[PDB]
Amino acid sequence: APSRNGMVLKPHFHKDWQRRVATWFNQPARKIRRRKARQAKARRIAPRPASGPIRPIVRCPTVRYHTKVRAGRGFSLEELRVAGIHKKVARTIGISVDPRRRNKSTESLQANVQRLKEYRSKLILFPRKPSAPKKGDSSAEELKLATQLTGPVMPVRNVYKKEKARVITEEEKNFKAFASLRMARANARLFGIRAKRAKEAAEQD
Amino acid sequence: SELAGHQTSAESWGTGRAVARIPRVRGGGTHRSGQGAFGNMCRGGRMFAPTKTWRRWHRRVNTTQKRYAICSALAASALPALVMSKGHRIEEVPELPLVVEDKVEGYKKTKEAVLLLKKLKAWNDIKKVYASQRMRAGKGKMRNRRRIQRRGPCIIYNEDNGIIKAFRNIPGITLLNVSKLNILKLAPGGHVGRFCIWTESAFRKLDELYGTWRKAASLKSNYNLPMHKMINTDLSRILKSPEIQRALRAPRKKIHRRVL
Amino acid sequence: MKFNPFVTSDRSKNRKRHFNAPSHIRRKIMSSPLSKELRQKYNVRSMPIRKDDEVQVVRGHYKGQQIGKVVQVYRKKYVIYIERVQREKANGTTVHVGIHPSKVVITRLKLDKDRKKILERKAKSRQ
RNA sequence: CGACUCUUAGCGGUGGAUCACUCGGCUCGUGCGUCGAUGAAGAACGCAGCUAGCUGCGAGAAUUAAUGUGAAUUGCAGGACACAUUGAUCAUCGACACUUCGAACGCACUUGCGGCCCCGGGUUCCUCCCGGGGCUACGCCUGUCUGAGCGUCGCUU
RNA sequence: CGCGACCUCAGAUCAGACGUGGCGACCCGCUGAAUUUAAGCAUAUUAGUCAGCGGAGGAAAAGAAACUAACCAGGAUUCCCUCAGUAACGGCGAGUGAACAGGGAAGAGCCCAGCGCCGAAUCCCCGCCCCGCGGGGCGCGGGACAUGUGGCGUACGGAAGACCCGCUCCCCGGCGCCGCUCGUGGGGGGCCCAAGUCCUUCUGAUCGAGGCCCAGCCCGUGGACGGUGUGAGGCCGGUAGCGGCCCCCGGCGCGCGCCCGGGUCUUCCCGGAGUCGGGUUGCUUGGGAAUGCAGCCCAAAGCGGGUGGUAAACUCCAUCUAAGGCUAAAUACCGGCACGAGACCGAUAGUCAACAAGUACCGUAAGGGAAAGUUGAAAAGAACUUUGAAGAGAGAGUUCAAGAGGGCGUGAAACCGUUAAGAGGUAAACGGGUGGGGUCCGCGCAGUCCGCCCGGAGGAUUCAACCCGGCGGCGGGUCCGGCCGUGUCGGCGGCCCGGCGGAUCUUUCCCGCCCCCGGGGUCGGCGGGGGACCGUCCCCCGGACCGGCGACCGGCCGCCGC
RNA sequence: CGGCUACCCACCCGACCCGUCUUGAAACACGGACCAAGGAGUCUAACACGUGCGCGAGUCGGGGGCUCGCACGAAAGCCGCCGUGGCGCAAUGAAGGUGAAGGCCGGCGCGCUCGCCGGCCGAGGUGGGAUCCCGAGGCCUCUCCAGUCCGCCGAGGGGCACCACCGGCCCGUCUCGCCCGCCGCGCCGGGGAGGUGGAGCACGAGCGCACGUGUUAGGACCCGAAAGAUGGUGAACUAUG
RNA sequence: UAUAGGGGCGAAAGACUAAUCGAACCAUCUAGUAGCUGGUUCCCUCCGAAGUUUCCCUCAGGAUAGCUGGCGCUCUCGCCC
RNA sequence: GAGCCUUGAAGCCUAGGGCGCGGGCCCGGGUGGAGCCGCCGCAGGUGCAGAUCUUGGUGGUAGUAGCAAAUAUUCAAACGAGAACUUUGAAGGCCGAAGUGGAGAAGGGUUCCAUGUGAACAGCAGUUGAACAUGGGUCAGUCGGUCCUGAGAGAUGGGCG
Ligand SMILES: [Mg+2]
Ligand SMILES: [Mg+2]
Ligand SMILES: [Mg+2]
Ligand SMILES: [Mg+2]
Ligand SMILES: [Mg+2]
Ligand SMILES: [Mg+2]
Ligand SMILES: [Mg+2]
Ligand SMILES: [Mg+2]
Ligand SMILES: [Mg+2]
Ligand SMILES: [Mg+2]
Ligand SMILES: [Mg+2]
Ligand SMILES: [Mg+2]
Ligand SMILES: [Mg+2]
Ligand SMILES: [Mg+2]
Ligand SMILES: [Mg+2]
Ligand SMILES: [Mg+2]
Ligand SMILES: [Mg+2]
Ligand SMILES: [Mg+2]
Ligand SMILES: [Mg+2]
Ligand SMILES: [Mg+2]
Ligand SMILES: [Mg+2]
Ligand SMILES: [Mg+2]
Ligand SMILES: [Mg+2]
Ligand SMILES: [Mg+2]
Ligand SMILES: [Mg+2]
Ligand SMILES: [Mg+2]
Ligand SMILES: [Mg+2]
Ligand SMILES: [Mg+2]
Ligand SMILES: [Mg+2]
Ligand SMILES: [Mg+2]
Ligand SMILES: [Mg+2]
Ligand SMILES: [Mg+2]
Ligand SMILES: [Mg+2]
Ligand SMILES: [Mg+2]
Ligand SMILES: [Mg+2]
Ligand SMILES: [Mg+2]
Ligand SMILES: [Mg+2]
Ligand SMILES: [Mg+2]
Ligand SMILES: [Mg+2]
Ligand SMILES: [Mg+2]
Ligand SMILES: [Mg+2]
Ligand SMILES: [Mg+2]
Ligand SMILES: [Mg+2]
Ligand SMILES: [Mg+2]
Ligand SMILES: [Mg+2]
Ligand SMILES: [Mg+2]
Ligand SMILES: [Mg+2]
Ligand SMILES: [Mg+2]
Ligand SMILES: [Mg+2]
Ligand SMILES: [Mg+2]
Ligand SMILES: [Mg+2]
Ligand SMILES: [Mg+2]
Ligand SMILES: [Mg+2]
Ligand SMILES: [Mg+2]
Ligand SMILES: [Mg+2]
Ligand SMILES: [Mg+2]
Ligand SMILES: [Mg+2]
Ligand SMILES: [Mg+2]
Ligand SMILES: [Mg+2]
Ligand SMILES: [Mg+2]
Ligand SMILES: [Mg+2]
Ligand SMILES: [Mg+2]
Ligand SMILES: [Mg+2]
Ligand SMILES: [Mg+2]
Ligand SMILES: [Mg+2]
Ligand SMILES: [Mg+2]
Ligand SMILES: [Mg+2]
Ligand SMILES: [Mg+2]
Ligand SMILES: [Mg+2]
Ligand SMILES: [Mg+2]
Ligand SMILES: [Mg+2]
Ligand SMILES: [Mg+2]
Ligand SMILES: [Mg+2]
Ligand SMILES: [Mg+2]
Ligand SMILES: [Mg+2]
Ligand SMILES: [Mg+2]
Ligand SMILES: [Mg+2]
Ligand SMILES: [Mg+2]
Ligand SMILES: [Mg+2]
Ligand SMILES: [Mg+2]
Ligand SMILES: [Mg+2]
Ligand SMILES: [Mg+2]
Ligand SMILES: [Mg+2]
């Protein structure tokens, strides 16, 4: 069966594939369905924005992706308590509540708190009666626009630091050599055996 | 086909029962019993290696070539000798790249549209399309496609205001927006050079939409105009400029045929 | 040009609905235009036909200025029969000849209450 | 010379290819997403003035009523042609009605053999008497009624 | 011995209600091969699929971690692209084959057992009124469930109780009614522009030609159909936030029913067992020192248990809380119900079925399973005569055609009959070469060539040679008149009343904060706003350069028609 | 009168019936009575190479989103603070990991088989090598001076692609060696010089689309078996109660 | 009336089991498999073979070289050696 | 292509005229009755002699083999267009009571019977028939099913799955 200098082929076709072929032909029809679903959602809600719940600021979890930042799921009830608002009241306001999320980072804690304070600033709500506990005048001409697009406060906004200019100094360019990583790596590899030999030297009395 | 021609059940007879080794239907009385079963060379068998609904129908083209072809078709629409060599009637028509006022795109009645085309002298071209809208030749008359009808002028506009309602049912005509162009409308049949009629705001918006060679396109993000291969290309001018004819050998024109 | 997504350009479906439409649609199909003086008088282009009109033929083998009365309407054959239009067989028996009602000009109607109502609906819709 | 045979061609016959047509298929997609003990799917039998199929119907059987429609169905007679009554035909169909088998249900299936309750006639009545109607399948749930137990226990002989 | 109370129970044609059977395209639970591949064949693969069985709905299933990860951490489920033909499995052969990170589509969370607090504060059945329709739901008395445990408060994100502070005093269902409302809610019917105007063909015309400087007429209608053919206007319909009537439906306003949450502090409460797990054996998985599942046996814990991917011990850390349950979305759909389209087939094709198709028919049965479209515009289907016993025929007639006569459009070949020509002992047929004849074509048959120039015989016209007048165009020049074009500077002019770019800068600035000692201090950091600097395109005049298909005028050269 | 013709006939010579398996076919080898219609290298995935196009150290929207509900619109167009991702730009190790710059001059340490310092250039060199450049001299009607202009050049210069070789550099191992570094002085790192294994570097050429050919998996050029499995229907003939 | 397919029944012939039996019939897996026969459809132009090496549970087959074709590419010619 | 056509397209035939080396084509003539082609691109289920090919049709063989198991017919008449076969008469025969007779079970389903036709079917023919068409015919307390159990088959209770 093989031939001249050609690559080894192992295609996965021995299984009777021609029976179970699901084929994209209804793909434009699904795109039109999902457009009509989104426009129906926009007309069926009210003043409430599309993609209504706000989403947090969240960093990926892999030595590969931790530089980036991602629109997460919810606001990690510690953060939502620091916002000073009750749990299901946040679900009614449009603030996403995800109780499994934990906060080790004070930085991302405070960043989520700032995002909560900005959302509570941008919030314009309408009670039924004339009590108007939270509201005002003709509220910015029905806030001049009904519905928003693609995240409420544009949840990505990947922040970019400058580190513009600085004069090179000493110590650094005499110190920060290649050998630091290798010495630290060997220190981390041999952290345990040195302690074991310390215990041996204590035992030998 | 997508379904069996193997609805019949079948077996062979073998080396005995002289006739053949094709599978045969098994039965009696009904005079299909003993005919040719599934296969190619038989009556009421499957076609050979039959068509399947997962054939690779659609094809992808690069977006830069999709824009390059639009630029090439619009550039071919500017020259008068190209578009007459497709088959339009531009003999008594004013300028090539026609550009009417923005009063056109607010029309509501089609009699003003016919009046506009008659005064712009493309009505001779519409009269050709009226002259040639014959019946289709072939087997295609059965499947819902009966009128051969040639393509006329395409009106290009922006900011839709009711020009579609006006120009819509003049036959053979094409009505087509600026920000959504078509190669299938700007070059029907794969030949370059379809006659076109523009509008003021459209014809101003073109240079915003594709740029010059000096500045980039503003509406389309990463796209520049294409590179240009020969800068000046009148080959007769180049060969009869003195810089070449200084450095030519000689016209050698003696024939020197066969000597007996 | 067709803009509904719920009506057919399809030749097969149109011929099938045509040759199998029931009688109360075959009435609308077998429709005749009115003469131009009567359309001036009534402001209506066309009408369904019935048993009792006064009918002139515009085209065929039997043409022109012969205003006769219809007698039968085969909606099964899409054919009306006119009283003057005859032909003998071989055996000397006369028989009516088939005329499709598109080739038919109505000169007088039969007036009736439902025809007055249909005529008033036509005039009110043409407005 | 004729007969026979062969080859062409004209004509004629057998034959049903090509072409043209298409109330038919196949594929793709949208919208919807509905059977049954209140007797389904399926099957049998029956029904028209002339009637075998197909189709449509069920002892009200080529459809009943009602709503819309507005003068026909049709191969031939007739019959209602009435419409200043209710108005032919056709469609829609929401009110009626829906033979026997069929999960089939009174027990089985040979259209057989029953059993109660009730109503009309019988001997003016029970005792294996005519007609009609109703009820009479299995399993299981909630409650009622009846009662078995040297199961546990009381009060009593 | 009797009676009573339960507890276990049976019976009934008890009162009322429910399940069965089907279709199975998609889904769910189990069971389950073999052809084949490996060139042989045992594991492997075919595949946990075909077949079998039981279930279900418009979707189902899944699902709010006994999770992923190991760093600045994510966060229910579902589906797509990637991960990836990779890590891994494998007579380490053939072959098999994931997942988390990432980006999208959709966005949703909850309840109960336990624990304790509330005097069973709870539910079902029967009976009477209550009320209003198209039709059934709250309240009052007596029969039961139930203390071996109804209901309220309650869920691992903590919860409860009791102080203290701070406010807030509610919402869902039913009914009448106004405009509504994203195609302009959904369904049902009926209707809505303009020529059959003129000659002309023809069997019939929807053929062809024509309509003033208003283009014959309508066009938000020129899709498509039928009608004696090939139609925008003769007809249905198509177009349109076109109009009218009829039905039902989703978002405003009177009645009935229900109605204290938050924060701090103190005390108290805090969980699912023959279950996890271990041994062993089978199946499956890529899961390898056993991923998952199941049988048997052994079988717990409370700073516990599980997970952290090479078995086991010691150790530290991270993460989750299993053995109870519910839930839309995105998603699959060859059955069905209608529906719209097609670079698809055109009656030996396309479903087997364009037609009385799962019909005729074969087999006892499981089951197998066809052939078969076309007259003509209109039946106008051949009256009548005349042979024959009738079939059949000859006249006549229908129509454009019987050269269309009831399986009837067009009618090929094999084959057969007859006529016309030619031929005949080496079977017929063929190739090369000719000859004879025949059908037919062309040619005009000893009269067939034409086109130009030049020299001769006629008339009839008016160029031309020459100029005048006029238009248009060629070709060049002062780049004149200006124009635009190419380069280089000047004015930065529009920099703030300019576009955009820049991980240039400007803490001498402005807002939210943080730091040090209510304020100040550059003491520094981040998010947000302006503006100095470079990089390109918008103007100005000035000068450089070229008149290039960038085009107009003047004068010049040289044509031109009138 | 001329005429080739798929008309027919005459005559001379040549002349075995086609298709395929085969060393060998007219074969006493097989298939073919005759005629009409149907009838066989298709499609997808994957790979390799050649070709055409666009962009270019990038490239690709194939998955989504954006536009008013319009036949052709299941089209086309746009996104870029949708580049996440694929392929490539960097290989090598089993892995822990590591990861491609040298040349020329001046000086110093014993210029010692040796390291350091200072300046400049920058992918080394050798032999061929299309092309290009320079050029002795050579030639154009009286004798002097002239310029473009003309063309051949012996020879010489820099040298593309590519070929051949040497030298250099990275990674794995092996051998021989001494020196330096110090988030902490250690069975710690870093380094040198040789000979080797590598799918390497030594100024990058890919990516996307389409077409062609070939190979593989798929019913795969078409038809063909004796078999095997699953699930059902038959004792009306026959066998025996 | 009973016995049903690797099953039944057999005074035993491997006989019979619906004209089939040394494993019945029908449908599906199924277009199963085949190194083995048969066929494999338009013209013209150009070039044009091999039946040999090695290895294979290979000896009617394949891989490998060799033979062939296509696609080119890099140079050489034209003006006493 | 201001393509071609009811003043005749597609297809078919053609001892007609030609072109190309061919694949094939163009025109003439006749049938034929409503659609057809050239070119530039594009996409295919794209070109027949065969496959004991499939389906449909027709030949040679051929007016041939063959219409022969069971002895057998003949005359006259009738109805009729038509008589070797139909019917009647007469004569001669066979079956010879274990039948070529008279009736039933299973099976068949209208074939039973009358009238009318003789187109196809009866393998010659036919005035005939079991062919076709029209219209008729099957009457039960005491004949049988129904009822009984037999060889057996099958349900609930139970068990297994
Ligand atoms: Mg090979
Ligand atoms: Mg492999
Ligand atoms: Mg397979
Ligand atoms: Mg199949
Ligand atoms: Mg099949
Ligand atoms: Mg078929
Ligand atoms: Mg055709
Ligand atoms: Mg269709
Ligand atoms: Mg003939
Ligand atoms: Mg036929
Ligand atoms: Mg009625
Ligand atoms: Mg029963
Ligand atoms: Mg009763
Ligand atoms: Mg094999
Ligand atoms: Mg084997
Ligand atoms: Mg498996
Ligand atoms: Mg199955
Ligand atoms: Mg069920
Ligand atoms: Mg359902
Ligand atoms: Mg939880
Ligand atoms: Mg990859
Ligand atoms: Mg597997
Ligand atoms: Mg028409
Ligand atoms: Mg029409
Ligand atoms: Mg109209
Ligand atoms: Mg396994
Ligand atoms: Mg724990
Ligand atoms: Mg533990
Ligand atoms: Mg633990
Ligand atoms: Mg749970
Ligand atoms: Mg659960
Ligand atoms: Mg769902
Ligand atoms: Mg046909
Ligand atoms: Mg068929
Ligand atoms: Mg007709
Ligand atoms: Mg004719
Ligand atoms: Mg005909
Ligand atoms: Mg005919
Ligand atoms: Mg003769
Ligand atoms: Mg062989
Ligand atoms: Mg041999
Ligand atoms: Mg041969
Ligand atoms: Mg042979
Ligand atoms: Mg033979
Ligand atoms: Mg063919
Ligand atoms: Mg390539
Ligand atoms: Mg990336
Ligand atoms: Mg086997
Ligand atoms: Mg078996
Ligand atoms: Mg079995
Ligand atoms: Mg028997
Ligand atoms: Mg077997
Ligand atoms: Mg047998
Ligand atoms: Mg095959
Ligand atoms: Mg087979
Ligand atoms: Mg060999
Ligand atoms: Mg070669
Ligand atoms: Mg016709
Ligand atoms: Mg042609
Ligand atoms: Mg042709
Ligand atoms: Mg095709
Ligand atoms: Mg084919
Ligand atoms: Mg053939
Ligand atoms: Mg052949
Ligand atoms: Mg054959
Ligand atoms: Mg045959
Ligand atoms: Mg024969
Ligand atoms: Mg003989
Ligand atoms: Mg004989
Ligand atoms: Mg005999
Ligand atoms: Mg007589
Ligand atoms: Mg006689
Ligand atoms: Mg006899
Ligand atoms: Mg005897
Ligand atoms: Mg007898
Ligand atoms: Mg006979
Ligand atoms: Mg008789
Ligand atoms: Mg009889
Ligand atoms: Mg009969
Ligand atoms: Mg009696
Ligand atoms: Mg008796
Ligand atoms: Mg049983
Ligand atoms: Mg049981």
Hunting for tokens 């007055």 — which residue is that? C116
Minimal CA–CA distance to C51: which of C24, C21, C81?
Answer: C81
| Contact partners, residue A19, CB within 8 Å, separation at least 6 | none
Q: Are B175 and B165 in contact (CB under 8 A)?
A: no
Backbone angles phi, psi at A173, to 5 degrees: -80, 5
- Report the alpha-carbon distance of residue B10 to residue C14 in Å, rounded: 41
Angle of helix A179-189 relative to helix A191-203, nearest 10 degrees?
50
Residue C85 structure tokens: 């239009």
Chosen from B142, B144, B165 to mutate, greatest number of chain C CBs within 10 A: B144
State the distance from the centre of ligand 75 to the C-alpha of B55, rounded, in angstroms. Answer: 77
Longest alpha-carbon distance in chain B: 97
E strands, C2-96, are 31-33, 46-48, 54-57, 68-74, 79-82, 86-88, 94-96
Asked if residue C113 keeps its beta carbon closer than 7 A to nucleic acid strand D, the reply is: yes
- Report the alpha-carbon distance of residue B158 to residue B209 in Å, rounded: 12
- Determine the nucleotide nearest to B21 by Cα–C1' distance: F224
Backbone angles phi, psi at C12, to 5 degrees: -65, -50
Residue A180 structure tokens: 């630091």
Contact C11 B144 (CB under 8 A): yes
Angle of helix B110-119 relative to helix B123-131, nearest 10 degrees?
110
- Report the alpha-carbon distance of residue B208 to residue C1 in Å, rounded: 34
CB-based neighbours (< 5 A) of ligand 5, an ion: B 6
**Pairs from B230-238 (Cβ < 8 Å, separation ≥ 24):** none
Q: What is the CA radius of gyration of chain A?
A: 29
CB-based neighbours (< 5 A) of ligand 6, an ion: B 44
* Distance (Å) of CA B32 to CA B5, B35, B128, B185: 15, 5, 57, 54
- Report the alpha-carbon distance of residue A175 to residue B84 in Å, rounded: 78
CA angle A61/A64/A68 to nearest 5° reads: 70
Q: What is the 3-state secondary structure (H, E, C) of B174-229?
A: EEEECCCCCHHHHCCCCCCCCCEEEEHHHHHHHHHHHCCCCCCCCCCCCCCCCCCC
